[PDB]
């Protein structure tokens, strides 16, 4: 390596611009190796002497420079940096502005063992013959490893993939196949699309498909589970007809292929014409799948289809605006559901996810949804709750403040104007303003939301017939808030209005002296509202009297807010618990769960700290509130989906802390199920709750383990797995984490699941953090530093620590690792989580024992 590399920055130079890529690769699954050839059509709009590409883990043999008048090809010199995963091609004779050239590079590499890029694995059949499968995960920066390219989403280009298969496999990609000793299939040329959407799969599969008003929707799967693809096609065809009507642009490809991958870490991918999925996520069987399992497969297919337009067709210029794709997809995912799939009551998950996202956003570790991103690790952490749900709340807020129809016009204009192009944060805002040329100037209103941390705190004071509103930052520079308040008059009549706050303080005029208010119409706004004690007390009385004047979304938003507010010390803890006394008149799921999550969170914290006494006192008092609702629950899979998951939460809550007869009944059902060798029908809703009880027995634990290896229902196994990991035998728990990590018997994709479940409860609480801590570099090899997977793990096992001593060790451990690792958001956020737990223990623990006492 004589001369040094010609580029000294992370981001690619803009002189070179690709037009067309030819990727012809030949892979041997036996040795986990392949040979690939990349032909790139490149136009240089700048006078340059050097060409730079992203490339890693590659054996390069020969490169060609060939755009001379009659020259066939010329040999060239390749240079590699490798710190930035970049390679430089010193082309002879400088490229001229506007002149097209063609670069072909020859290389060899290995199939990776990590869950990233081009990877392969071996899975076992029903007939028990080992088979191999190859898949693609290029998003976000894994294309570099696969083939040498301009690995940046703004460098859109056309792609033609030529792939070779070993026997008579299924070779699939973005475009349909037309190729006729081993066979070589060449897929057709595709739309100008980014490099990270390139996808190709190689394995033994079968196909179930239907025509959808011109296009062929194919849902592929491994021969074993091809019967379980019936539900996916039903929804996929229904959704595509729905999405094509609300975005008048129709699907641009001849074939839409959704595939169920045996392993695969991410829930699903959006690769144009090749939706890659998790087998647990795409497959479904009514007999063995729960209501939540039916809801999970519906939303992911809804979420994946939205990307076809948001991200595939029109995508972000750079990841610092990644919320411009996932934020839109998540919004469009739950919006689509609410119109064509209202039965599912999918608003609940969106609410809960926003409640959980708002807590992470409120921390000082949070960043703006449009935030400067430079390092590779900085890019990897962009796939967090904010991008999915703070970008999704931002979109939701606009739809409610503005009209529903206007949103369609802003959406449709946005897609056509920027089709097959890179967009920015500001590009999206003009589109709203373009269709609405009034005094709105959206880009100024949304500049506050997209350029700063957190959300506002709306403090509401009512004196007489005036509503006093002030906006404050949330912690333990000014936004434009769309306030929406629901008032009840003295004749108890419904009346609702909306106002916009662009100032720190405000006063809203009321028509008549009211009984109470609600300051956020449902959730709908990305902010937290605090009320005056009397106004807070007014809400509690109404709730104690009749809770149905409010919504379930409106009543569970009150619970999340009061506890969040109670946690940080703004308002005394008792008043938060004082509100949750209306549970007797409560039959809806969203208020019940958010109360249960708030109580379940508190109990887990105390249990860790040795306060066994206080913890059970808490779940007792809550059990007595919900004793009526809990006791009338039937183990029968009966009721409209929201009712079905309403059952599981209560059955889980009673059984997890050994309350009532839940354990008594579940033991009997499990014995019935076990003494039937798994043949006997056991209801989908109560399966996980029964499995948890069955796993307490060593025989039950061992019997279940035999089923997990034995059965093929992925949805039923993840229910069983939750039972094994909820076991209290630390020796059993440790083994589960070691198995997935190495991948024997347990697939590595569950490692985050097992580590998170192990760390929740007292046995294995220390075990989970230590296994993450002591196996950390093996974990960084499997999932990149900054990845959701590794950020999920850190947060999954560190949220229940509440001690300054514990805070000192997590902080010290990451110091021991590296400066790149210690500056990570996951380390910084999860350490701050522990901090707040110290304070919550400080401010409310002492008093909590006061309301939690038996007074003579
Ligand atoms: C279709 O797409 C084009 C390109 O995205 C849109 O053009 C954009 O229009 C906005 C209007 O606000 C321009 O923003 C302006 O920027 C200057 C300074 O940079 C500022 O002085 C103005 O007050 C305003 O902020 C924006 O520049 C322009 N795009 C580009 C690339 O310049 C167009 O509005 C879209 N909609 C249609 C044509 O209906
Ligand atoms: N951006 C692309 C992919 C880039 S990788 S994102 C990180 C990774 C991930 O782990 N998700 C959570 C998850 C989901 C299923 C099983 C396990 C786990 C992790 C756990 O067990 O905790 N996959 C995704 O999130 C898929 C999500 C699309 C999506 C679908 C359904 C939704 O309801 C929301 C969102 N992502 C995209 O389209
Ligand atoms: C990859 O290499 C393996 C061997 O290392 C090939 O597998 C066998 O190859 C021999 C000769 O090519 C055949 O006679 C066998 O029947 C093959 N059987 C099995 C089960 O693999 C394999 O064909 C090669 N594949 C590619 C795509 O190159
Ligand atoms: C019962 O409540 C309703 C809620 O709409 C009252 O209707 C309006 O009340 C406000 C406040 O007094 C007035 O400003 C409006 O003009 C009322 N609407 C009319 C008059 O059409 C309603 O008036 C209440 N019933 C009464 C006062 O008898
Ligand atoms: C209970 O079910 C298991 C499978 O979960 C049975 O074990 C397999 O049975 C098949 C036939 O169904 C045999 O061909 C295999 O040899 C068995 N596998 C193993 C690992 O032993 C089992 O026979 C069923 N009943 C009992 C009482 O064991
Ligand atoms: C994988 O391939 C790369 C590129 O050819 C090569 O450097 C390396 O020796 C192979 N694998 C590992 C883990 O070393
Ligand atoms: C790369 O190719 C060269 C030349 O064919 C060879 O000597 C070397 O072993 C190859 N590297 C790998 C990792 O296969
Ligand atoms: C390269 O081909 C494109 C095809 O779109 C054409 O626009 C361009 O004129 C060609 N290059 C030059 C320097 O003209
Ligand atoms: C699988 O693909 C073929 C390709 O022609 C198609 O005709 C067939 O209908 C598909 N199989 C089904 C729907 O079972
Ligand atoms: C079983 O549930 C009922 C429902 O009220 C409860 O009263 C009873 O105490 C439970 N059985 C126990 C605790 O043994
Ligand atoms: Zn997504």
DSSP letters for 521-590: SSS-SSSEEEE-HHHHHHHHHHHHH-GGGS-HHHHHHHHHHHHHHHHHTSS-HHHHHHHTTGGGG---HH
Facing residues of 171 across strands? 202
Half-sphere exposure in the Cβ direction for 484 (13 Å, CA): 15
Distance CA 426, CA 447 (A): 9
Facing residues of 276 across strands? 259
Look at ligand 2, atom 10, and give the residue with the nearest C-alpha.
266
Angle between helix 788-798 and 825-851 (nearest 10): 30
b (16+ CB within 10 A) / e for 839-852: ebbebbbeebeeee
Look at ligand 4, atom 14, and give the residue with the nearest C-alpha.
511
Distance CA 682, CA 713 (A): 14
Q: Hey, is 437 helix, strand or coil?
A: coil
And the tokens for 845? 């623990």
Q: Between the CA of residue 672 and those of 38, 675, 726, 854, what are the distances in Å?
A: 60, 5, 21, 40
The count of other CB atoms within 10 Å of the CB of residue 699 is 9
Distance CA 55, CA 235 (A): 39
How far is residue 430 CA from its own chain's centroid?
28
Cβ atoms 218, 257 nearer than 8 A: yes
Distance CA 67, CA 20 (A): 14
DSSP assignment letter at 446: H
Q: Between the CA of residue 268 and those of 97, 276, 281, 448, what are the distances in Å?
A: 41, 6, 8, 32
Indicate the domain borders of the chain: 1-205, 206-454, 455-531, 532-856
Q: Which residues contact 451 (CB under 8 A, 6 or more apart)?
A: 368, 370
Q: Is 434 in the pocket of ligand 1 (CB under 6 A)?
A: yes
Cβ atoms 411, 493 nearer than 8 A: no
Cβ atoms 824, 379 nearer than 8 A: no
Distance CA 758, CA 766 (A): 9
Cβ atoms 648, 689 nearer than 8 A: yes
Q: Is 664 in the pocket of ligand 5 (CB under 6 A)?
A: no
Q: Is 100 in the pocket of ligand 8 (CB under 6 A)?
A: yes
CA 26 to ligand 3: nearest atom: 27
Residue with tokens 């059970």: 616
Q: Is 346 in the pocket of ligand 2 (CB under 6 A)?
A: no
Q: Is 680 in the pocket of ligand 5 (CB under 6 A)?
A: no
And the tokens for 762? 């007292």
Q: Smallest Cα–Cα separation from 257: which of 216, 299, 205?
A: 216
Number of H helices, E strands in the chain: 31, 27
Q: Smallest Cα–Cα separation from 720: which of 712, 108, 741, 331?
A: 712
Cβ atoms 111, 34 nearer than 8 A: yes
Q: Smallest Cα–Cα separation from 22: which of 9, 50, 41?
A: 41
Neighbours of ion ligand 11 (CB under 5 A): 326, 329
CA 112 to ligand 6: nearest atom: 1
Q: Smallest Cα–Cα separation from 95: which of 127, 47, 37?
A: 47
Distance CA 828, CA 821 (A): 10
CA Rg, the chain, in Å?
Answer: 28
Distance CA 477, CA 189 (A): 48
Distance CA 353, CA 333 (A): 13
| Max CA separation in the chain (angstroms) | 101
Q: Between the CA of residue 26 and those of 59, 67, 406, what are the distances in Å?
A: 14, 27, 50
Distance CA 553, CA 338 (A): 14
Q: Smallest Cα–Cα separation from 359: which of 605, 572, 594, 574?
A: 594
Q: Between the CA of residue 201 and those of 120, 281, 320, 518, 714, what are the distances in Å?
A: 10, 18, 29, 52, 21
DSSP assignment letter at 549: G
Look at ligand 2, atom 21, and give the residue with the nearest C-alpha.
753
By the 10 Å C-beta count (0-12 exposed, 13-18 middle, 19+ buried), 313 is classed as: buried
Q: Smallest Cα–Cα separation from 95: which of 157, 54, 155, 40?
A: 40
Pairing relationship of beta strands 117-124 and 130-137 according to DSSP bridges: antiparallel
Cβ atoms 305, 236 nearer than 8 A: yes
Catalytic residue among 304, 594, 607, 716: 304
Method: X-ray
Q: Which of 36, 37, 59, when mutated, tests ligand 7's pocket best, judged by the most ligand atoms within 8 Å of its CB?
A: 59
Phi, psi angle pair for 178, to nearest 5°: -140, 65
Annotation-wise, does 267 bind a ligand?
yes
Got the DSSP string for 392-442?
HHHHHHHHHHS-HHHHHHHHHHHHHHTTTSEE-HHHHHHHHHHH--SS--H
Q: Between the CA of residue 290 and those of 350, 398, 499, 641, 713, what are the distances in Å?
A: 19, 34, 42, 10, 12
Distance CA 779, CA 109 (A): 23
And the tokens for 107? 């290389």
How far is residue 277 CA from its own chain's centroid?
14
Q: Smallest Cα–Cα separation from 138: which of 161, 110, 115?
A: 115
594 is catalytic: no
């Amino acid at each position: 390596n004589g001369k040094l590399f010609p580029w000294a920055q992370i981001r690619l130079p803009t002189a070179v611009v690709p037009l067309r890529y030819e990727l012809s690769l030949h892979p041997n699954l036996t040795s986990m190796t392949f040979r690939g050839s990349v032909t790139i059509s490149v136009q240089a709009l700048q006078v340059t002497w050097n060409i730079i590409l992203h490339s890693t883990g590659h054996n390069i043999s020969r490169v060609t420079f060939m755009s001379a008048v009659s020259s066939q090809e010329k040999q060239a010199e390749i240079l590699e940096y490798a710190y930035h995963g970049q390679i430089a091609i010193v082309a002879p004779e400088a490229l001229l502005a506007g002149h097209n050239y063609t670069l072909k590079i020859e290389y060899s590499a290995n199939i990776s063992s990590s869950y990233y890029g081009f990877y392969g694995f071996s899975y076992t059949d029903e007939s028990n013959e080992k088979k191999y499968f190859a898949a693609t995960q290029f998003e976000p920066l894994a294309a570099r490893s696969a083939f040498p390219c301009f690995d940046e989403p703004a460098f859109k280009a056309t792609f033609i993939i030529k792939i070779i298969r070993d026997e008579q496999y299924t070779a699939l990609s973005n475009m349909p196949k037309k190729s006729s000793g081993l066979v070589q299939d060449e897929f057709s040329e595709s739309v100008k699309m980014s490099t990270y959407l390139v996808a190709f799969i190689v394995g033994e599969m079968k196909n179930l498909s239907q025509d959808v008003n011109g296009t062929l929707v194919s849902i592929y799967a491994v021969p074993e589970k091809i019967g379980q693809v019936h539900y996916a096609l039903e929804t996929t065809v229904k959704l595509l007809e729905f999405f094509q009507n609300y975005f008048e642009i129709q699907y641009p490809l001849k074939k839409l292929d959704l595939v169920a991958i045996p392993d695969f870490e991410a829930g699903a991918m959006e690769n144009w014409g090749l939706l890659t999925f998790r087998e647990e996520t795409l497959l479904y069987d009514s007999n063995t799948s729960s209501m939540a399992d039916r809801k999970l497969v519906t939303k992911i297919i809804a979420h994946e289809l939205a990307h076809q337009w948001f991200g595939n067709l029109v995508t972000m210029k750079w990841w610092n605006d990644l919320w411009l794709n996932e934020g839109f997809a998540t919004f469009m995912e739950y919006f689509s559901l609410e119109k064509i799939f209202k039965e599912l009551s999918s608003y609940e998950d969106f609410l809960d996810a926003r409640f959980k996202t708002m807590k992470k956003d409120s921390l000082n570790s949070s960043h703006p949804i449009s935030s400067s991103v430079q390092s590779s690790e900085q890019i990897e952490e962009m796939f967090d709750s904010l991008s999915y749900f703070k970008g999704s709340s931002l979109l939701l807020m606009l739809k409610t403040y503005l009209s529903e129809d206007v949103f369609q016009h802003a959406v449709v204009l946005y897609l056509h104007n920027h089709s097959y192009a890179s967009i920015q944060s500001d590009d999206l805002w003009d589109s709203f303003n373009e269709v609405t040329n009034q005094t709105l100037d959206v880009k100024r209103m949304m500049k506050t939301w997209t350029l700063q941390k957190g959300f506002p705190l709306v403090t509401v004071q009512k004196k007489g017939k005036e509503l006093f509103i002030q906006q404050e930052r949330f912690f333990l520079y000014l936004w434009h808030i769309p306030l929406s308040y629901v008032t009840e008059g003295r004749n108890y009549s419904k009346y609702q209005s909306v106002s916009l706050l662009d100032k720190k303080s405000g006063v809203i005029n009321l028509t008549e002296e009211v009984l109470w208010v609600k300051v956020n119409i449902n959730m709908n706004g990305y902010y937290i509202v605090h009320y005056a004690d009397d106004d807070w007390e007014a809400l509690i009385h109404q709730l104690k009297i009749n809770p149905y004047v409010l919504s379930d979304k409106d009543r569970a938003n009150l619970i999340n807010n009061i506890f969040e507010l109670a946690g940080l010390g703004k308002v005394p803890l008792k008043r938060a618990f004082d509100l949750i006394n209306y549970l007797g008149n409560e039959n809806h799921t969203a208020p019940i769960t958010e109360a249960l999550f708030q109580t379940d969170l508190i109990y887990n914290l105390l249990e860790k700290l040795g306060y066994m006494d206080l913890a059970s006192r808490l779940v007792t008092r809550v059990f007595k509130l919900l004793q009526n609702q809990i006791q009338q629950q039937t183990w029968t899979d009966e009721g409209t989906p929201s009712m079905r998951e309403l059952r599981s939460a209560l059955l889980e809550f009673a059984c997890t802390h050994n309350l009532g007869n839940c354990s008594t009944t579940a033991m009997k059902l499990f014995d019935d199920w076990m003494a039937s060798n798994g043949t006997q029908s056991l209801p989908t809703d109560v399966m996980t709750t029964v499995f948890k009880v069955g796993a307490k027995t060593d025989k039950g634990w061992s019997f279940l383990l035999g089923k997990y290896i034995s059965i093929g229902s992925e949805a039923e196994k993840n229910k069983i797995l939750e039972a094994l990991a909820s076991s209290e035998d630390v020796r059993k728990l440790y083994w589960l984490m070691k198995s997935s990590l190495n991948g024997d018997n347990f697939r590595t994709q569950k490692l985050s699941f097992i580590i998170r479940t192990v760390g929740r409860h007292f046995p294995g609480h220390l075990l989970a953090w230590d296994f993450v801590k002591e196996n950390w570099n093996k974990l960084v090899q499997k999932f990149p530093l900054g990845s959701y997977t590794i950020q999920n793990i850190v947060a999954g096992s560190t949220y229940l620590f509440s001690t300054k001593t514990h805070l000192s060790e997590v902080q010290a451990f990451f110091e021991n690792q590296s400066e790149a690792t210690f500056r990570l958001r996951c380390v910084q956020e999860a350490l701050e989580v522990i901090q707040l737990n110290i304070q919550w223990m400080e401010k409310n623990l002492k008093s909590l024992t006061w309301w939690l006492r038996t007074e003579t």
